[PDB]
Design a protein around this ligand. Structure first.
Ligand SMILES: *[C@@H]1O[C@H](CO)[C@@H](O[C@@H]2O[C@H](CO)[C@@H](O[C@@H]3O[C@H](CO[C@H]4O[C@H](CO[C@H]5O[C@H](CO)[C@@H](O)[C@H](O)[C@@H]5O)[C@@H](O)[C@H](O[C@H]5O[C@H](CO)[C@@H](O)[C@H](O)[C@@H]5O[C@H]5O[C@H](CO)[C@@H](O)[C@H](O)[C@@H]5O)[C@@H]4O)[C@@H](O)[C@H](O[C@H]4O[C@H](CO)[C@@H](O)[C@H](O)[C@@H]4O[C@H]4O[C@H](CO)[C@@H](O)[C@H](O)[C@@H]4O[C@H]4O[C@H](CO)[C@@H](O)[C@H](O)[C@@H]4O)[C@@H]3O)[C@H](O)[C@H]2NC(C)=O)[C@H](O)[C@H]1NC(C)=O
Ligand SMILES: *[C@@H]1O[C@H](CO)[C@@H](O[C@@H]2O[C@H](CO)[C@@H](O[C@@H]3O[C@H](CO[C@H]4O[C@H](CO)[C@@H](O)[C@H](O)[C@@H]4O)[C@@H](O)[C@H](O[C@H]4O[C@H](CO)[C@@H](O)[C@H](O)[C@@H]4O[C@H]4O[C@H](CO)[C@@H](O)[C@H](O)[C@@H]4O)[C@@H]3O)[C@H](O)[C@H]2NC(C)=O)[C@H](O)[C@H]1NC(C)=O
Ligand SMILES: *[C@@H]1O[C@H](CO)[C@@H](O[C@@H]2O[C@H](CO)[C@@H](O[C@@H]3O[C@H](CO)[C@@H](O)[C@H](O[C@H]4O[C@H](CO)[C@@H](O)[C@H](O)[C@@H]4O)[C@@H]3O)[C@H](O)[C@H]2NC(C)=O)[C@H](O)[C@H]1NC(C)=O
Ligand SMILES: *[C@@H]1O[C@H](CO)[C@@H](O[C@@H]2O[C@H](CO)[C@@H](O)[C@H](O)[C@H]2NC(C)=O)[C@H](O)[C@H]1NC(C)=O
Ligand SMILES: *[C@@H]1O[C@H](CO)[C@@H](O[C@@H]2O[C@H](CO)[C@@H](O)[C@H](O)[C@H]2NC(C)=O)[C@H](O)[C@H]1NC(C)=O
Ligand SMILES: *[C@@H]1O[C@H](CO)[C@@H](O[C@@H]2O[C@H](CO)[C@@H](O)[C@H](O)[C@H]2NC(C)=O)[C@H](O)[C@H]1NC(C)=O
Ligand SMILES: *[C@@H]1O[C@H](CO)[C@@H](O[C@@H]2O[C@H](CO)[C@@H](O)[C@H](O)[C@H]2NC(C)=O)[C@H](O)[C@H]1NC(C)=O
Ligand SMILES: *[C@@H]1O[C@H](CO)[C@@H](O[C@@H]2O[C@H](CO)[C@@H](O)[C@H](O)[C@H]2NC(C)=O)[C@H](O)[C@H]1NC(C)=O
Ligand SMILES: *[C@@H]1O[C@H](CO)[C@@H](O[C@@H]2O[C@H](CO)[C@@H](O)[C@H](O)[C@H]2NC(C)=O)[C@H](O)[C@H]1NC(C)=O
Ligand SMILES: *[C@@H]1O[C@H](CO)[C@@H](O[C@@H]2O[C@H](CO)[C@@H](O)[C@H](O)[C@H]2NC(C)=O)[C@H](O)[C@H]1NC(C)=O
Ligand SMILES: *[C@@H]1O[C@H](CO)[C@@H](O)[C@H](O)[C@H]1NC(C)=O
Ligand SMILES: *[C@@H]1O[C@H](CO)[C@@H](O)[C@H](O)[C@H]1NC(C)=O
Ligand SMILES: *[C@@H]1O[C@H](CO)[C@@H](O)[C@H](O)[C@H]1NC(C)=O
Ligand SMILES: *[C@@H]1O[C@H](CO)[C@@H](O)[C@H](O)[C@H]1NC(C)=O
Lengths: 208, 279, 232
């Protein structure tokens, strides 16, 4: 589940089943690729290091749900949010509340950095070929990559990771292509064509 | 002909099982066919006065240190009594009129232990009783026209009906009372206190009505004492709630207390005790 | 200060005894209450259980029969044992200090109150995978910079870890010297069942050298520590 908020506005996030008794709900902000950081306990009591921006619902209300109020949303707050529910009426939950991804909107645009790498020489004597296109710092992660044999598309061997955000608006995607030793020398020059959001950028390489 | 599958909640005291996997029945169904009180009437004890017909008189004993029996020195005459409200309860007389000078005891035979020892107060010890559960009244029609007022789901936390009495005030009033026991049991004696011996809920607990429900409150907490004399705190009390009552020898009736919707809090004065004694 | 450091196999075959440990620092194991939390990939964290000296230790109901906890006071370590692992058990196992609390909705008299917990300080975790596939060691072929007479200004260099199992693999450049411009990419799983991640640094034009550029790759599940020198 995803929440998209304009910059500088206030976000809200919904966690868990409806309340049954007076509760004590914990709020966690897990950033992509990192560990969960404790944000709020006692339903509104935030520890050291957390600004008074983040809020919640006091666990004194029955029938309503657990709400997280992010005031003045900033870019860093892009993360997954979990919550641990302690209802006086329901047994101790060991399955954390299901996630809710915050998405600040209009970062707005990042042009990818495509870094094409030929196979390494030690790999060449080892009888294996591999092409390493490396796409960094792009937004958003909607990149689709094709490969060209001097003028012609390549069908098989194509390997490509997923656009992966990393503690920053920047994304990341690799692109490997397994090739036979005889064909890196046979063809003229190989092409990595990375397509992002509507802009295609292509990097080629030629053998020595 | 057609029937339903309605659901309702009942207190522990009302139901009793018979052994499908498990079952239950109302505790009144084996004794007497019951009637529900209309949720239109109220049970509030209003001050009632007892007046005499023509050619009749009622004599009021305006004597402070009056032990109820014998020649009252200063007597007045009145047509109607002062406002006496029907506060009905056990082990604790509530909201009545306190004694004027000293806590004076009244008993038929102080020697015959089998006679109850009615005790009147001089200060109204304060008691606050509640039931915190915010409740539901779902009107289950069992037609025609007949409308059972069932309880529905519970809104909020769960915690029983309790009673609060300031410890200090009661620790002082009990001394004031034992001070008047020693004028019956020797200048220097020791007066212990204990809870009820054994019997029904109506006898061994604080049977009373407040706001529409009938509390039966344990009395063991208050009677903790032993009397050797020649800040802020309360003594919390733990009450069970009943709806199907059989009040009176067996002549009240069995009557279904219509469930109250909301939180029920009442404040009351205690003005006396109904004591008993066991060389 | 405070610091946590999980450790363990990082892979165990089905129906075995996964044994994980949590290196403790900054305080004693006797003082704080501890808790463990596994997190499957892409799913919501399932809390494991809480342990403290003096036997204040309880486990998850969903896995109550299989788990075991302990603390080594002398070694000052948070132990963990789990038996009969299966595919459903593969996750990132974190280690968290935990604090107790009392929520009181009543008069307290009853017992009408409840202990709610909150883990304020976490650990980095350890990726525990589960598969009957034997380990493979990583191969490392050093990707030479852009063509031997690279374009004018702001050149780029890279390494390559291919055909390693299982995740993860840790990388650092000259024992973590540069730690600037490193953009270590995620791994890609192949058809064979092996991962492969690239690591690349960006270096300015004054890179004719010869500056000593040797990337360091560690894959503990095969005890493979390969440090390779890259040259144009
Ligand atoms: C018969 O007699 C018995 C006694 O024998 C009596 O029993 C009593 O019943 C009452 C109710 O019936 C019950 O009250 C409850 O008390 C709860 C706990 O309060 C106690 O602790 C706190 C703090 O202690 C903890 O933290 C300390 C550090 O801060 C730490 O050192 C402690 O060790 C401990 O860990 C303390 O504040 C309380 O003292 C309160 O009352 C004192 C007088 O009794 C007073 O001197 C204190 O100040 C304080 O009262 C207020 O004081 C400050 C200013 O000084 C104000 O800012 C506050 O307004 C304080 O209220 C006690 O030591 C209490 O939490 C319960 O209330 C929560 O739960 C109810 C029900 O769910 C909710 O409706 C409430 O809204 C409230 O929920 C709020 O707080 C909780 C937890 O903090 C949060 O989860 C909620 O989010 C919400 O708080 C947050 O959001 C709200 C929402 O708007 C927001 O306003 C807040 O800003 C916050 O953001 C409840 O009141 C009592 O405990 C019980 N027994 C005793 C011994 O008292 C029977 O009831 C009597 N029966 C009769 C007469 O019928
Ligand atoms: C010993 O003595 C003490 C004090 O003498 C006594 O405490 C009293 O308890 C009773 C109930 O337990 C209290 O009565 C309640 O009073 C309020 C409202 O009263 C005021 O409201 C208006 C507001 O403007 C005032 O102007 C006015 O002057 C009143 O004083 C309410 O909480 C209650 O109202 C409901 O209950 C009654 C029927 O049970 C009716 O009075 C009233 O119609 C309400 O009933 C309604 O409830 C339903 C709920 O859904 C509703 O749907 C229906 O329409 C229904 O009509 C109640 O009147 C009283 O105030 C307490 N004492 C004082 C001084 O306030 C102890 O009870 C007594 N000891 C014992 C054992 O009885
Ligand atoms: C929901 O129900 C479950 C039970 O089904 C309940 O779990 C219980 O939690 C309480 C504490 O909240 C546990 O009580 C502890 O038991 C251990 C056993 O050795 C004791 O050592 C503990 O004593 C210490 O802890 C107390 C609480 O912090 C301290 O006040 C005390 O001074 C001691 O330091 C304590 O008594 C109980 O064992 C479990 N029961 C089970 C079966 O797990 C859970 O709390 C309930 N949740 C809610 C929100 O009501
Ligand atoms: C009606 O039902 C009640 C409840 O079952 C019966 O009360 C029981 O009486 C026996 C007497 O031998 C006691 O031992 C039980 O403890 C009582 N139960 C309860 C819940 O109080 C009552 O006897 C029944 N009336 C009959 C059969 O005429
Ligand atoms: C409970 O007791 C108090 C006494 O402490 C009563 O308050 C007195 O009420 C009488 C009339 O009934 C007044 O003449 C007094 O002046 C009142 N005293 C004070 C200090 O205000 C109270 O009415 C009693 N409540 C009942 C019987 O329900
Ligand atoms: C008990 O629960 C009922 C809900 O059924 C509460 O009634 C609500 O009261 C608020 C304001 O008091 C209103 O805005 C809602 O519309 C009411 N709901 C309904 C369904 O009528 C009631 O307030 C609760 N009692 C207490 C003391 O909290
Ligand atoms: C019974 O209830 C009354 C009222 O709720 C309590 O009297 C209050 O006492 C506080 C001091 O703690 C005062 O600030 C209030 O003004 C009082 N209220 C009224 C209406 O006078 C009383 O303390 C309660 N008694 C017990 C034993 O719980
Ligand atoms: C009166 O109080 C005594 C305690 O002084 C109660 O005796 C207990 O009764 C329970 C039965 O429910 C036993 O399990 C306990 O072992 C008894 N305690 C002792 C010290 O003997 C007695 O039940 C109370 N009776 C009433 C009517 O309140
Ligand atoms: C009334 O209160 C007394 C004491 O507060 C209760 O006696 C307890 O009974 C249980 C068993 O039911 C024992 O485990 C406790 O040790 C007893 N307490 C004491 C202090 O002895 C009693 O159960 C309550 N209810 C009745 C009807 O008497
Ligand atoms: C009467 O009060 C006393 C104390 O006020 C209660 O005695 C308790 O006795 C047990 C062992 O017999 C001790 O472990 C407790 O510490 C005592 N209480 C206190 C406050 O120290 C006794 O239970 C009370 N009787 C009833 C029936 O409630
Ligand atoms: C009171 O009780 C005693 C013995 O229990 C008895 O002898 C006496 O007749 C009773 N009545 C009195 C004293 O009026
Ligand atoms: C208060 O109560 C205690 C026991 O609960 C008793 O020993 C003491 O005498 C009491 N105080 C007075 C003034 O009677
Ligand atoms: C003995 O009791 C009487 C009243 O019964 C009282 O007046 C007197 O003071 C007591 N003797 C004492 C306290 O020494
Ligand atoms: C950390 O772990 C190692 C190996 O498990 C162990 O030798 C050491 O005692 C642990 N504790 C510290 C503080 O290093």
């Amino acid at each position: 589940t995803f929440v998209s908020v304009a910059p500088g506005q206030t976000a809200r996030i919904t966690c868990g089943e409806e309340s049954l008794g007076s509760r004590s709900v914990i709020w966690y902000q897990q950033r992509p690729g990192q560990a969960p950081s404790l944000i709020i306990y006692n339903n509104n009591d935030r520890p050291s290091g957390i600004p008074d921006r983040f809020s919640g619902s006091p666990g004194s209300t029955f029938g309503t749900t657990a709400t997280l109020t992010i005031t003045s949303v900033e870019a860093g707050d892009e993360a997954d949010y979990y919550c641990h529910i302690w209802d006086s009426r329901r047994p101790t939950n060991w399955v954390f509340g299901e996630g809710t991804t915050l998405i600040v909107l209009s970062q707005p645009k990042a042009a990818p950095s495509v870094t094409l790498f030929p196979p390494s020489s030690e790999e060449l004597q080892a009888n294996k070929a591999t092409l390493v296109c490396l796409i960094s710092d792009f937004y958003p992660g909607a990149v689709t990559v094709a490969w060209k044999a001097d003028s012609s598309p390549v069908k098989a061997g194509v390997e490509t990771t997923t656009p992966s955000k990393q503690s920053n608006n920047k994304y990341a995607a690799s692109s490997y292509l397994s090739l036979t030793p005889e064909q890196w020398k046979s063809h003229k020059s190989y092409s990595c064509q990375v397509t992002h959001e509507g802009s295609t950028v292509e990097k080629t390489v030629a053998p020595t | 002909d057609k029937k339903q599958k309605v659901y309702s909640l009942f207190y522990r005291l009302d139901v009793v099982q018979i052994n499908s996997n498990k079952e239950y029945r109302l505790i009144n169904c084996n004794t007497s066919a019951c009637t529900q009180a209309c949720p239109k009437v109220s049970f509030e004890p209003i001050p009632i006065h007892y007046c005499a017909p023509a050619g009749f008189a009622i004599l009021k004993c305006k004597d402070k240190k009056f032990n109820g029996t014998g020649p009252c020195p200063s007597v007045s005459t009145v047509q109607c009594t002062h406002g006496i409200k029907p506060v009905v309860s056990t082990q604790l007389l509530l909201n009545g009129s306190l004694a004027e000078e000293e806590v004076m005891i009244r008993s038929e035979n102080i020697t015959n232990n089998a006679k109850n020892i009615l005790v009147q107060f001089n200060t109204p010890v304060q008691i606050n009783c509640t039931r915190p559960m915010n409740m539901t009244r779902k009107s289950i029609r069992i037609g025609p026209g007949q409308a059972f007022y069932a309880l529905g789901d519970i809104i909020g936390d769960i915690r029983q009906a309790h009673c609060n009495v300031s410890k200090a005030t009661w620790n002082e009033t009990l001394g004031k009372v034992v001070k008047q026991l020693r004028k019956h049991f020797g200048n220097n004696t020791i007066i212990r206190f204990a809870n009820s011996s054994g019997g029904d809920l109506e006898v061994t607990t604080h049977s009373f009505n407040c706001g529409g429900e009938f509390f039966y409150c344990n009395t063991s907490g208050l009677f903790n004492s032993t009397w050797i004399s020649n800040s802020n705190d309360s003594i919390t009390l733990p009450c069970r709630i009943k709806q199907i009552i059989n009040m009176w020898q067996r002549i009240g009736q069995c009557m279904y207390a219509p469930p109250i919707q909301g939180v029920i809090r009442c404040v009351s004065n205690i003005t006396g005790l109904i004591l008993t004694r066991d060389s | 200060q405070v610091h946590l450091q999980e450790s363990g196999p990082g892979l165990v075959k089905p129906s075995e005894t996964l044994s994980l440990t949590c290196n403790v620092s900054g305080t004693l194991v006797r003082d704080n209450y501890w808790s463990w939390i596994r997190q499957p990939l892409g799913k919501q964290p399932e809390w494991i259980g809480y342990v403290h000296d003096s036997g204040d230790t309880n486990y998850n109901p969903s896995l109550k029969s299989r788990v075991h906890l302990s603390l080594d006071k002398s070694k000052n370590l948070v132990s963990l044992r789990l038996t009969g692992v299966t595919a459903a058990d593969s996750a990132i196992y974190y280690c968290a200090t935990t604090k107790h609390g009392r929520r009181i909705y009543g008069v307290v008299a009853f017992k009408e109150w409840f202990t709610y917990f909150y883990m304020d300080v976490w650990g980095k975790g350890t990726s525990v995978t589960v598969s009957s596939a034997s380990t493979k060691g990583p191969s490392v072929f050093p990707l030479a910079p852009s063509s031997k007479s690279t374009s004018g200004g702001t050149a780029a260099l890279g390494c390559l870890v291919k055909d390693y199992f299982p995740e993860p693999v840790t990388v650092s450049w000259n024992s973590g010297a540069l730690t600037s411009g490193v953009h270590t990419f995620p791994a890609v799983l192949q058809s064979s069942g092996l991962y492969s991640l690239s690591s690349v640094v960006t270096v300015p034009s004054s890179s004719l050298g010869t500056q000593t550029y040797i990337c360091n790759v560690n894959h503990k599940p095969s005890n493979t520590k390969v440090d390779k020198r890259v040259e144009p």
